[PDB]
GROMACS .gro file of C-alpha atoms in nm:
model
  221
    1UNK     CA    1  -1.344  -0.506   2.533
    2UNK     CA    2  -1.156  -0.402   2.211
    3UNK     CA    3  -1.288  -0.170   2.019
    4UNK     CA    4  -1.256  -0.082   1.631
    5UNK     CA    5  -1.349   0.166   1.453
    6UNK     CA    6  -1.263   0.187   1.025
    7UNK     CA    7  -1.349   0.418   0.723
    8UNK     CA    8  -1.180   0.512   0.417
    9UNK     CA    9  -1.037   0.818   0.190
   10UNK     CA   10  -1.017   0.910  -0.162
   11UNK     CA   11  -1.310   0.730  -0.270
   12UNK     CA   12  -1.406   0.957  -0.625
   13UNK     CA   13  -1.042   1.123  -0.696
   14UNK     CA   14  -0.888   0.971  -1.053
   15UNK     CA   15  -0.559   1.072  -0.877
   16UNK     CA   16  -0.448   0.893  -0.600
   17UNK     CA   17  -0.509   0.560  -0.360
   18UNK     CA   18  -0.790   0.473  -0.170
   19UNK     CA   19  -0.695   0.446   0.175
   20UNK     CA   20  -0.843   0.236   0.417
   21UNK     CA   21  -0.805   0.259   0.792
   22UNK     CA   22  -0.884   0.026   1.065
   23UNK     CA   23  -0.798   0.150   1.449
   24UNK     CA   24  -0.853  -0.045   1.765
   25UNK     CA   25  -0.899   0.107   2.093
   26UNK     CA   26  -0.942  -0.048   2.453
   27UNK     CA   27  -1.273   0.054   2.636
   28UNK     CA   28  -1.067   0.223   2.894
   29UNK     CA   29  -0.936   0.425   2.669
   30UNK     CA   30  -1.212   0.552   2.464
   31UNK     CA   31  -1.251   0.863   2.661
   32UNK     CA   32  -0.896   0.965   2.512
   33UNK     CA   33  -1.080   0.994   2.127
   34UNK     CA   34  -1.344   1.218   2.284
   35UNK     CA   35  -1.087   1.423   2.494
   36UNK     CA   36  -0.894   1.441   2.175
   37UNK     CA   37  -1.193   1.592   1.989
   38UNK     CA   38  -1.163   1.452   1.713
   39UNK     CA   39  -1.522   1.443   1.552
   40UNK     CA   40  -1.458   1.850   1.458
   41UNK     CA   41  -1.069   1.769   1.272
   42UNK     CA   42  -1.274   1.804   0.971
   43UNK     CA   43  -1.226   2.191   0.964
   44UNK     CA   44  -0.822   2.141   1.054
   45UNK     CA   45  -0.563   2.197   0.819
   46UNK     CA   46  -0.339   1.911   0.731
   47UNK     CA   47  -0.031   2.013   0.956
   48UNK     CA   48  -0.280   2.037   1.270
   49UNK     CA   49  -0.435   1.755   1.168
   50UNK     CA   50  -0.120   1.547   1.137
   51UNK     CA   51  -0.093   1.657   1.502
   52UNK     CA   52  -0.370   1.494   1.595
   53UNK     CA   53  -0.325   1.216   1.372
   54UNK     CA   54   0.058   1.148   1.583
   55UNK     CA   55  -0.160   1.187   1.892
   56UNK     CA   56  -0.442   0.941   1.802
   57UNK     CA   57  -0.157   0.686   1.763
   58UNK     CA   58  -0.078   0.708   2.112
   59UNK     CA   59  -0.361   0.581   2.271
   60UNK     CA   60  -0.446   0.306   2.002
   61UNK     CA   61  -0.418  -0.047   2.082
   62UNK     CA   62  -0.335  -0.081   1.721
   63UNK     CA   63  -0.430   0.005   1.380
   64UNK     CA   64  -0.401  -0.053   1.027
   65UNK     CA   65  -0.416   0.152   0.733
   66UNK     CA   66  -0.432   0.032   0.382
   67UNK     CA   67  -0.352   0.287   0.070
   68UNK     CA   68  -0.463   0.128  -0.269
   69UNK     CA   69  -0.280   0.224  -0.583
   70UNK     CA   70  -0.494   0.348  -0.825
   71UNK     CA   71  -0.439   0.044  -1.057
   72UNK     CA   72  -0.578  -0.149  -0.843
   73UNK     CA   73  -0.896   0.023  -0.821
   74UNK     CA   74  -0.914   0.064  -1.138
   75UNK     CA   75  -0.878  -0.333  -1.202
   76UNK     CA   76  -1.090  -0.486  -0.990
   77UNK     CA   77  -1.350  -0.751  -1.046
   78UNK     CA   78  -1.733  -0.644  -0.912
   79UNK     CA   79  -1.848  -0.308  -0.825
   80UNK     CA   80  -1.639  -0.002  -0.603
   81UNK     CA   81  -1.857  -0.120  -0.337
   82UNK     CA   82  -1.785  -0.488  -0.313
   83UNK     CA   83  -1.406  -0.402  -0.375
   84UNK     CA   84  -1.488  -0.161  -0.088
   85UNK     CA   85  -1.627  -0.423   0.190
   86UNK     CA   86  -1.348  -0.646   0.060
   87UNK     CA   87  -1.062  -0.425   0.188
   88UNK     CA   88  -1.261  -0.323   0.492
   89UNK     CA   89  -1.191  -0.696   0.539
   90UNK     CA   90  -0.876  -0.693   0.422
   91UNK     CA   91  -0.813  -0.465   0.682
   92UNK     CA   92  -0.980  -0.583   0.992
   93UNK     CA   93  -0.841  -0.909   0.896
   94UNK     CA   94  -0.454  -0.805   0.934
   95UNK     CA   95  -0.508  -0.621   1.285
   96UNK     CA   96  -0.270  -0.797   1.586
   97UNK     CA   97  -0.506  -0.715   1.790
   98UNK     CA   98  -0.839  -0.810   1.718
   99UNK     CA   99  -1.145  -0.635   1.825
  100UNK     CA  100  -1.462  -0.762   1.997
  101UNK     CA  101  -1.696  -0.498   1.853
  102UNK     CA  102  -1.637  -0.310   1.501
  103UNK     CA  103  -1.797   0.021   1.420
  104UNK     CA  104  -1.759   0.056   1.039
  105UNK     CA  105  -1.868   0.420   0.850
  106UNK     CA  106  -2.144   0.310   0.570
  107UNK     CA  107  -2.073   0.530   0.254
  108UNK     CA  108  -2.414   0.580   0.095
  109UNK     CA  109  -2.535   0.175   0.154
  110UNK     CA  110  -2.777  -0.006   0.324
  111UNK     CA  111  -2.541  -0.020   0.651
  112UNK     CA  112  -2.777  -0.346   0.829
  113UNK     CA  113  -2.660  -0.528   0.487
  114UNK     CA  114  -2.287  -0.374   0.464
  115UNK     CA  115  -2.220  -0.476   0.861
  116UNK     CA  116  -2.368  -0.830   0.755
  117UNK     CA  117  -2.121  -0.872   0.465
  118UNK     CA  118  -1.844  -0.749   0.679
  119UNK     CA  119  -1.914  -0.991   0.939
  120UNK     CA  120  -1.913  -1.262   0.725
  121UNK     CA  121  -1.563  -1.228   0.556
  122UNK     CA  122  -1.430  -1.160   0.873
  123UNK     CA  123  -1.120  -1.473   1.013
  124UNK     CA  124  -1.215  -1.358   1.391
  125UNK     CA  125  -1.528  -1.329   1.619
  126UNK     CA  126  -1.697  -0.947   1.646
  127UNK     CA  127  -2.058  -0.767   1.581
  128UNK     CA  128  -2.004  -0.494   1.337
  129UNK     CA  129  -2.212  -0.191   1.340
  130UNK     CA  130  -2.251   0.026   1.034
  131UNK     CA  131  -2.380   0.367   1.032
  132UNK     CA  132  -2.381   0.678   0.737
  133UNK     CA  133  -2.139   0.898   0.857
  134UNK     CA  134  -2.051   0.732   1.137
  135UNK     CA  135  -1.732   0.957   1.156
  136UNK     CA  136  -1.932   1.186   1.306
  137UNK     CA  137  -2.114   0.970   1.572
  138UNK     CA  138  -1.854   0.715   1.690
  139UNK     CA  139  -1.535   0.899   1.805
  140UNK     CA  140  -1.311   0.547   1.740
  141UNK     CA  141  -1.443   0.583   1.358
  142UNK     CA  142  -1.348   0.969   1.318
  143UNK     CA  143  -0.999   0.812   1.439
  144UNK     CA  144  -0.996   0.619   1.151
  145UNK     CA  145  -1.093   0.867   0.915
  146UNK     CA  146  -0.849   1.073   1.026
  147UNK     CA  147  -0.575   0.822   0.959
  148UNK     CA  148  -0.731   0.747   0.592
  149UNK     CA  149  -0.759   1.151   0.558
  150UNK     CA  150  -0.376   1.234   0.658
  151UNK     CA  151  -0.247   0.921   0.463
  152UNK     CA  152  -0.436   1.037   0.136
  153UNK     CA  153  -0.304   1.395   0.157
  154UNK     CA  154   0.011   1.235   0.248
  155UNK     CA  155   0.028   1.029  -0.081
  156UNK     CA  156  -0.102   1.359  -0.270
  157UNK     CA  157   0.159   1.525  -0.177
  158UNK     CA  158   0.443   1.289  -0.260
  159UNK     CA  159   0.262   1.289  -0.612
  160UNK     CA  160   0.311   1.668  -0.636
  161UNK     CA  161   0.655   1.654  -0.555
  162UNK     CA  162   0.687   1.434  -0.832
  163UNK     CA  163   0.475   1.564  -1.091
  164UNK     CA  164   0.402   1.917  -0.978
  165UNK     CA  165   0.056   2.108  -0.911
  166UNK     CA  166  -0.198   1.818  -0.975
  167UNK     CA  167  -0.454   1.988  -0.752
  168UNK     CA  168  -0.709   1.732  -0.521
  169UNK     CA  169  -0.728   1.452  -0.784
  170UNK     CA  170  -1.148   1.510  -0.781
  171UNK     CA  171  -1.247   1.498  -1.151
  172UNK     CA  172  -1.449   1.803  -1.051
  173UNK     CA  173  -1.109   1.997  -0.990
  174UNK     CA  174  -0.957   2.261  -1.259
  175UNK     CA  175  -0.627   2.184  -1.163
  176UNK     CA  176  -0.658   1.840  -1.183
  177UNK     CA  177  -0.836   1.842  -1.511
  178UNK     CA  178  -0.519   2.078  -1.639
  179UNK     CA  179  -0.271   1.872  -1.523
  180UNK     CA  180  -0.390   1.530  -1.680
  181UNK     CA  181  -0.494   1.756  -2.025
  182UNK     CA  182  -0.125   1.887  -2.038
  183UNK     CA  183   0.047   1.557  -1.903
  184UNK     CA  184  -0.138   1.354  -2.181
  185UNK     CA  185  -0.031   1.610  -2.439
  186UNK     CA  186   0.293   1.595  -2.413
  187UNK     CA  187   0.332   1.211  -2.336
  188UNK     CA  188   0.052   1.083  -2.561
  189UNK     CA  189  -0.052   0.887  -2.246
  190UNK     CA  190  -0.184   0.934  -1.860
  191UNK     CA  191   0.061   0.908  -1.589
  192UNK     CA  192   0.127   0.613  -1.395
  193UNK     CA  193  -0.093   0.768  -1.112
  194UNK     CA  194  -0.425   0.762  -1.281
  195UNK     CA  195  -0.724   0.501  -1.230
  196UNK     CA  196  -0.765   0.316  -1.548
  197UNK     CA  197  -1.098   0.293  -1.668
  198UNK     CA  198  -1.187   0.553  -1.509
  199UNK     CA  199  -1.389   0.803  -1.737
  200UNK     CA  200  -1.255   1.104  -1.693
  201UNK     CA  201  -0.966   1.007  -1.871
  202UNK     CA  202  -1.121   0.899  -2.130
  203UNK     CA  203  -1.305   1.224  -2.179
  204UNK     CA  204  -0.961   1.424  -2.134
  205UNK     CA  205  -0.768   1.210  -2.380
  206UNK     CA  206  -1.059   1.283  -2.662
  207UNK     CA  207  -0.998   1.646  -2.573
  208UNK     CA  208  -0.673   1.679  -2.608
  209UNK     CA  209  -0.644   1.475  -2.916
  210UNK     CA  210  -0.909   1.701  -3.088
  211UNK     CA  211  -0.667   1.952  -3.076
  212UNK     CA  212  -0.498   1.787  -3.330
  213UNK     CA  213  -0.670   1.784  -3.679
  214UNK     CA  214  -0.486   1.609  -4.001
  215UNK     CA  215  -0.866   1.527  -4.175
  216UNK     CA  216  -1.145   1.724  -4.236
  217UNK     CA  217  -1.466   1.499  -4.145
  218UNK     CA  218  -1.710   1.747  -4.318
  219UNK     CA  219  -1.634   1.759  -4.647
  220UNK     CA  220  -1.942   1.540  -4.705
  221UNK     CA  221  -2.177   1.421  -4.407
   0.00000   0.00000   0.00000
């Protein structure tokens, strides 16, 4: 049998895609993932884990990986986690090799009802299995979330080449907080990296224009 295994990346950053990953492995091969260790690449640094990441590739079947412009995500229709099941689909969809049984990691969700809803969207025949953090308990899933991990940081860093220090992209994150204050300041808008709607930027663009004062409002209240 073929199987699959798929997760996804940058889920809360305001910087940044959302990647998606889909991998397919053959039975005989699954012993490879485990060999490979890769359900403790959590606690790797990105240059060791982009040496996994090359040798995950090698015994894949084949594999897809999907990285979602923040406008995107910022423009969709329903709710993050119907846009989410729809790219899962998206992804499992555009695999050459299709896969006979799909293990799919269930961020926060009833996973019986998320591997239903997958199933059903899905061109080609397969049982999908959800589980919470199944990166942890299926090693063909922490494949895939190693893929989505290494192509976010990936697209993270080509941002900071291009813009400079804009730290994780979490709206929890100084430096990312600093960079979109001081961007917005001097542009009088967000950069073309940013997820529109998104509140954070909201909040940061009535900061930085309260800096800016050319009316008292208390002069009567």
């Amino acid at each position: 049998m073929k199987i699959a295994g798929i997760d996804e990346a940058g889920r809360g950053p305001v910087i940044g895609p959302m990647v998606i990953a889909a991998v397919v492995v053959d039975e005989n091969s699954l012993p490879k993932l485990e060999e490979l260790k890769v359900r403790d690449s959590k606690k790797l640094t990105p240059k060791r884990r982009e040496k996994l990441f090359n040798e995950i590739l090698g015994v894949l079947d084949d594999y897809v990986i999907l990285e979602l412009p923040p406008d995107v995500i910022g423009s969709r229709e329903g709710t993050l986690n119907e846009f989410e099941v729809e790219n899962f689909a998206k992804a499992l969809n555009s695999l050459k090799v299709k896969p006979d049984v799909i293990y799919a990691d269930a961020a926060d969700v009833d996973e019986e009802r998320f591997a239903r809803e997958l199933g059903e969207r899905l061109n080609f025949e397969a049982e999908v299995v959800a589980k919470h953090k199944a990166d942890d308990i299926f090693p063909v899933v922490s494949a895939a979330s190693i893929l989505a991990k290494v192509t976010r940081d990936r697209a993270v860093e080509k941002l900071k080449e291009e813009y400079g220090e804009i730290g994780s992209g979490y709206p929890s994150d100084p430096r990312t907080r600093a960079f979109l204050e001081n961007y917005y300041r001097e542009h009088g808008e967000f950069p073309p990296i940013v997820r529109k709607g998104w509140k954070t930027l909201k909040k940061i663009a009535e900061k930085v224009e309260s800096e800016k004062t050319q009316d008292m409002i208390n002069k009567s209240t």
